[PDB]
Scaffold this active site. Sequence first.
Site, PDB file in Angstrom:
ATOM      1  N   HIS A  88      49.038  72.729  76.052  1.00 26.55           N
ATOM      2  CA  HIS A  88      50.241  71.941  76.038  1.00 26.55           C
ATOM      3  C   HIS A  88      51.245  72.359  75.597  1.00 26.55           C
ATOM      4  CE1 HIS A  88      51.428  68.294  74.262  1.00 26.55           C
ATOM      5  NE2 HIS A  88      50.905  67.108  75.504  1.00 26.55           N
ATOM      6  N   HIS A  89      51.929  72.648  74.954  1.00 27.33           N
ATOM      7  CA  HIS A  89      53.116  74.010  75.367  1.00 27.33           C
ATOM      8  C   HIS A  89      52.906  74.911  74.104  1.00 27.33           C
ATOM      9  CE1 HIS A  89      52.600  72.229  70.694  1.00 27.33           C
ATOM     10  NE2 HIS A  89      53.239  73.487  70.133  1.00 27.33           N
ATOM     11  N   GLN A 144      52.685  81.174  69.377  1.00 26.76           N
ATOM     12  CA  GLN A 144      51.707  79.357  68.546  1.00 26.76           C
ATOM     13  C   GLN A 144      51.685  79.271  70.599  1.00 26.76           C
ATOM     14  OE1 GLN A 144      53.590  76.230  66.545  1.00 26.76           O
ATOM     15  NE2 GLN A 144      51.697  76.632  65.117  1.00 26.76           N
ATOM     16  N   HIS A 168      49.629  76.112  72.145  1.00 29.59           N
ATOM     17  CA  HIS A 168      48.579  74.966  71.723  1.00 29.59           C
ATOM     18  C   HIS A 168      47.609  74.535  73.057  1.00 29.59           C
ATOM     19  CE1 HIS A 168      48.422  70.036  71.795  1.00 29.59           C
ATOM     20  NE2 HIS A 168      48.036  70.009  70.808  1.00 29.59           N
ATOM     21  N   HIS A 220      62.236  67.622  66.931  1.00 30.87           N
ATOM     22  CA  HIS A 220      60.805  67.853  66.380  1.00 30.87           C
ATOM     23  C   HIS A 220      60.379  67.240  64.989  1.00 30.87           C
ATOM     24  CE1 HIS A 220      56.478  68.917  65.274  1.00 30.87           C
ATOM     25  NE2 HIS A 220      56.971  69.122  63.624  1.00 30.87           N
ATOM     26  N   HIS A 242      56.534  64.119  64.000  1.00 31.75           N
ATOM     27  CA  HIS A 242      55.298  64.132  64.572  1.00 31.75           C
ATOM     28  C   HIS A 242      55.386  62.672  64.638  1.00 31.75           C
ATOM     29  CE1 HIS A 242      54.130  67.010  61.182  1.00 31.75           C
ATOM     30  NE2 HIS A 242      54.796  68.237  61.981  1.00 31.75           N
ATOM     31  N   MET A 283      58.282  65.193  59.692  1.00 35.85           N
ATOM     32  CA  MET A 283      59.007  66.288  60.086  1.00 35.85           C
ATOM     33  C   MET A 283      60.747  66.327  60.654  1.00 35.85           C
ATOM     34  SD  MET A 283      57.242  70.222  60.659  1.00 35.85           S
ATOM     35  CE  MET A 283      56.625  71.063  59.149  1.00 35.85           C
TER      36      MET A 283
HETATM   37 CU   LIG Z   1      51.450  70.940  72.563  1.00 35.40          CU
HETATM   38 CU   LIG Z   2      55.614  69.514  61.813  1.00 34.33          CU
END
Ligand SMILES: [Cu+2]
Ligand SMILES: [Cu+2]
Length: 305
Positions: free
Chosen positions: A63-64, A126, A128, A193, A195, A265
């Site tokens: 996804h990312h 990271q 996803h 960023h 949520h 966030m």
């Molecule tokens: Cu993602």
């Molecule tokens: Cu966050």
Amino acid sequence: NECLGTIGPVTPLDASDFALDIRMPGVTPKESDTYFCMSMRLPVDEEAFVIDFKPRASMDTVHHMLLFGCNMPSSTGSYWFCDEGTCTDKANILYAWARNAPPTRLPKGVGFRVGGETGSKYFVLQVHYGDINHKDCSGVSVHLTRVPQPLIAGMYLMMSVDTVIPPGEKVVNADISCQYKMYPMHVFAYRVHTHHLGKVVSGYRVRNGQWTLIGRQNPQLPQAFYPVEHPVDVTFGDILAARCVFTGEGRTEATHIGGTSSDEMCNLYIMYYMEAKYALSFMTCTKNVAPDMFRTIPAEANIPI
Ligand SMILES: [Cu+2]
Ligand SMILES: [Cu+2]
Ligand SMILES: [Cu+2]
């Protein structure tokens, strides 16, 4: 991309340059929306400059991806679920790759400084995995050089810490503001960023009361680093201001700033370059020094995009 196997993660590109591949060690997610992390110590102790990134993502499942620079990755393992954390110290974001929003290249002559005495000693990746026996070795190939770059990339992170979103609340603004007190920086990219409750996020340079848009974006759209409409210099005396617009509609309890999906966030990553002799690699603003200034924030900051 395919696992590297016998050749290893370091490819010489010339006498002073090399490519470092940061890849998941053949992982196999078992649930949708899994976040995996892994780290790599830099191969060289002396200072180097990151001058390019090439994504090596499996288009179907990834996804990312985000790449950070730091000195203390959360786990000493092979990989881990990032809910354990990315870094113990402050993680410096260097790159984001989002599925439906191709990244933009770094301006030529611009590089992040890493390694050496003060630069990041590790890279933390990271990945996803959204939609999922086969082992995945997705990641990023980083172009490193020993050649000092004329322009140094850095990050100015604006982030809320105190926001509280009452349940069902229609609109909740999270404002951030700091006065800039360093040599000038030129913003060339930004990433927002938030949520699920975030509607819009906007950042601005305010000079003599005038507001210049750095970036404005719907945090629900792919959270990539998008290029700035026009390069914006920020100089000693200017004030950086940001606003995230949230809603509490849909929640039965209050939402505060935090690391989980039920938390929120308000982060705006402002990527910039500075002349090498004046450069500092990172700055952060978690305060709101000019609260009343927001009485003059462009209307666009409150209208969804
Ligand atoms: Cu993602
Ligand atoms: Cu966050
Ligand atoms: Cu300029």
